[PDB]
Amino acid sequence: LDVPSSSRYDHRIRYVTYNPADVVQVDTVLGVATHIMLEEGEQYLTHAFGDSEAYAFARKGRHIFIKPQAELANTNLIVVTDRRSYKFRLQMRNDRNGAMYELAFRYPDTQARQTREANARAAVEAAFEQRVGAYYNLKYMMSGDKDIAPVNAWDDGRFTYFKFSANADLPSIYFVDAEGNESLVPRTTVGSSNNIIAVHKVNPKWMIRLGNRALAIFNEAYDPNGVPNDTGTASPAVRRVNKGGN
Amino acid sequence: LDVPSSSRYDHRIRYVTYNPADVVQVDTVLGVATHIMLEEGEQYLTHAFGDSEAYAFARKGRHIFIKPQAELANTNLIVVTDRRSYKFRLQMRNDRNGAMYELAFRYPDTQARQTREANARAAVEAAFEQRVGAYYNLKYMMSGDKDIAPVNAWDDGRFTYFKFSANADLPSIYFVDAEGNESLVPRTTVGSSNNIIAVHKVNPKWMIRLGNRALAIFNEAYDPNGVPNDTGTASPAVRRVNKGGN
Amino acid sequence: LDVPSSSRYDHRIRYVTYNPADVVQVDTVLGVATHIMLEEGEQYLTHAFGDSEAYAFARKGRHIFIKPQAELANTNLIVVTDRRSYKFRLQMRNDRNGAMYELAFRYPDTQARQTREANARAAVEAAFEQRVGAYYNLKYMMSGDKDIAPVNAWDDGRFTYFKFSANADLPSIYFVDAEGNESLVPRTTVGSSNNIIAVHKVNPKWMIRLGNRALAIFNEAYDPNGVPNDTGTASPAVRRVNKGGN
Amino acid sequence: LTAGGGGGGELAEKLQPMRLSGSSAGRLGNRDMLITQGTQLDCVLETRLVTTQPGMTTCHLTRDVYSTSGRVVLLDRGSKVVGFYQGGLRQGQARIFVQWSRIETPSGVVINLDSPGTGPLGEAG
Amino acid sequence: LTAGGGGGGELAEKLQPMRLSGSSAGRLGNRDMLITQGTQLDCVLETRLVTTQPGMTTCHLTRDVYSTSGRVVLLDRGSKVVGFYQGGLRQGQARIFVQWSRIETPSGVVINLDSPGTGPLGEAG
Amino acid sequence: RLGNRDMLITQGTQLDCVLETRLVTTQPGMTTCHLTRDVYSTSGRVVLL
Amino acid sequence: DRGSKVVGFYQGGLRQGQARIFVQWSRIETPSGVVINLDSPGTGPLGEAG
Amino acid sequence: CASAPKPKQPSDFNREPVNKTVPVEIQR
């Protein structure tokens, strides 16, 4: 028997920590309506009374109202939602003292699970931001129309970064292969001021076009081997794991 | 007469382990509704009371609600389902003590079946990964556009593996016949970082193409006889057994 | 009077062995439901009581429930199915003791029938396998494109077998007549690893084609006379008999 | 015995959105008992083909076909595939559409693959 | 056992307003598990293509494809894309419209991207 | 799965027969031929035709 | 922001005497995740239609 | 008078081993 705990402001609002192997001791009185407060997103499925006509039951979504509609009602209420089952021991008070207006639940299990994802998301973000053990290639040379040129270009072994000044237009960057053909390469724009274009490849030669002006970028320390992507992410400290199961 | 065992938080929640050759003692006091819970996926077909008028019945999916609707309602409940068939011995406690709110079943049969299938899956997986009795051919030459070349090529007697570095685009690999004609060969991309292309055939010559660049691979130690596939799988330690019968 | 035998767990659960020559002694107490479970795939046809008014009957597929509905319920139940007709002696108990919840069966007739079919199939398979007194012609030559050649060719006087290595594509094999015309011959792939094409004919010459490569196969000990097919099967031990009668 | 404003007509019609609904990724169930779309089955053509009259073709698999995981052989070598063509050629055409209908394993497995037959390098027809 | 004035026709039709409804900006939910419209997937064509008959194409991703955030590999390299064309060319056309239908990841992920297939620089068909 | 392979002839089986009637396609007509060889089952063990 | 990816489409092709195709830009994506459906016309560098 | 071009044929002059070092997938 778990007794709902009254608030410090008024003894008439009560809280209980849900327990799948326990029953809530509901001390109802004459002529008051008790609000049972269910969890957000719970799909109410069924309720059952051990004495149905002793109590009045109405539901609106996740809100439960009960009220004693008969004399000497000592019965049980069990309401099953999509995730769990609730247990109640409805004992009426003869003296009509110390009623129950709202009964609210606390879920250690659900908030504890959510505590896990908050911690895990924080760990994932920290792992992306530490970027430990990265080697940077700076041997990049350029030749062409220098007015669309970056101020800095480098790669970390996985992506290639071109940094542009604030007064420059951000041009379009193309992947140049061995025979000289240009092809599309995906880009993401990073940096606090969005001044860096990160392309998702390391290549020996690059093409930068803007309007009718062209600039060629040459990686002068191209490493064919590179570093393998064993984790599924852009960081060695974050693993992409198969959730879908199936 | 399997008498269930109560929780510690409240006597009103009681558990019993299923058994197909025993019945469960259910105590149905006056004024309570008992929650009989079936396992997920279990399909209810029908049921039969010792007295239909004696007790109240209500099912919603896999949830059974019962309630004594008459005096001296001492009867039997037999509810049959897709998987199993339960057996209850309903008997009212005239003193309105020892009420039961839920009857939770623990099933050793499904547990044994899951443990058996999990063990079989683990054995099959271990046999696949062990790959003992494997002979490796490493006598491979190449001539052509070396920029799309593998860093390694070998074969194990059944499949040919081409390994590519991390900065290399994965090319398309074709099967070359005696007259020089290329044709498709089925492909699977394996390796921790998807760096190995495994083609499902051992052949003297291979064609690697990426764009307008081409590279020819030559198996210098081609073994026409190979290793016979008597088991139906890629491993000699895993059979492929005809389930369908018919 | 086949008396069902109780289980070691609860007396209410009893087992009986079916017999086309004995009746089952069914003991019913008042206000309990007896579950008489039928066989798998067992198609219930009809039943018939001594008193439709002494026993309540409910059926759902292969599940049959009964209930005593009158005093001195001393009647008989005969439920007939396509496989078999059951038979029970229904005797109501005036003490409400020694109840029966389910009646579970065991079927010697079905397993006896199954063992005959298994024995017949096993005998036929043994006869197909034994293949005693077999002479094999091995004088086969070949000329043409040897890259598609078999590793072994022979015939047993009825079929011709070409064995191909593991790393070899299986080609298409054609019948060559006296004028040099090729025509389709039926084939079946045999061997543990599907390495052998058995063609259903013995011929002096064969042609093997794979793509644009051809290989001629010559039977250098061709027997025009062969071994007659007096049985109608591929083996002299198995006889094909006319079931259709008419 | 038994119990019982409307204007801008051209420019506004050219500015109607094309709203393509997004997709959501799934996952294949058992990849050891599964051959997925786009797998190339290499077979050898048995019947000589002449497209005067509609007719049925036949070929046999030259090689084993493995599952999408590359671990289990799902279609054996020597499996008989049965197809058909119809309709003939038009002027300027040089390839006939062949649909393959069913494949029979040398051990009794039949699966209805109603697939397009192609050339040795995947060219249609 | 069981329980239970109207004139100015030309000029006043040329002055009919074009009222185009405004838009409201939204936000992408998880930019780590999302590949958005206009991402360029670089694959390598496997089947040789001849547009005499309607057919089905196949290609494999040459590179890893990252999320919008550029932080997670969503489509691995070597993933098999399956497409199709139909209808053939008209006089004066030199490009066929190929639609790519599904992509299968080497780890078993399938997603229905029903996208236009383009050339190496995104020119349609 | 095919049920009984010893009592089965499947699609794509080639039946070799020899034409009896001379064929001239001026008028619609009926042809006739006789099997030259025994035709076995898919298992290759029983002569079905 | 700059680097925001804009996605459009064209259709129909040109007729004789035409030298500009009508492109409609459909949606834009900000490098920080903001997407707004702008179904605007695509023009040349000085606003000439198509 | 017109036949579809063939793909590039690789040159046969620079024939060299593919495996400069043994892979680690052989566990060597």
Residue numbers in the entry:
A (entry chain i), B (entry chain f), C (entry chain c): 21 to 266
D (entry chain b), E (entry chain e): 150 to 153, 177 to 297
F (entry chain Y): 199 to 247
G (entry chain h): 248 to 297
H (entry chain g): 17 to 44
What is written in the article reporting this PDB entry?
Bacterial conjugation is the primary means by which antibiotic resistance genes spread among bacterial populations. The recent cryo-electron microscopy (cryo-EM) structure of the conjugative Type 4 Secretion System (T4SS) encoded by the plasmid R388 revealed that the remaining VirB proteins form a large assembly organised into four sub-complexes: the outer membrane core complex (OMCC), the stalk, the arches and the inner membrane complex (IMC). Previously, we solved the cryo-electron microscopy (cryo-EM) structure of a conjugative T4SS. In this article, based on additional data, we present a more complete T4SS cryo-EM structure than that published earlier.
Further analysis employing 3D classification reveals a degree of heterogeneity in the positioning of the two extra TrwF/VirB9NTD-TrwE/VirB10NTD sub-complexes within the I-layer. We obtained three distinct OMCC structures, each characterised by a unique arrangement of the two extra sub-complexes in the I-layer. Although the structure of each complex forming the I-layer do not change significantly (RMSD of 1.06 Å), a shift between corresponding complexes in the superposition of conformations A and B or A and C is observed.
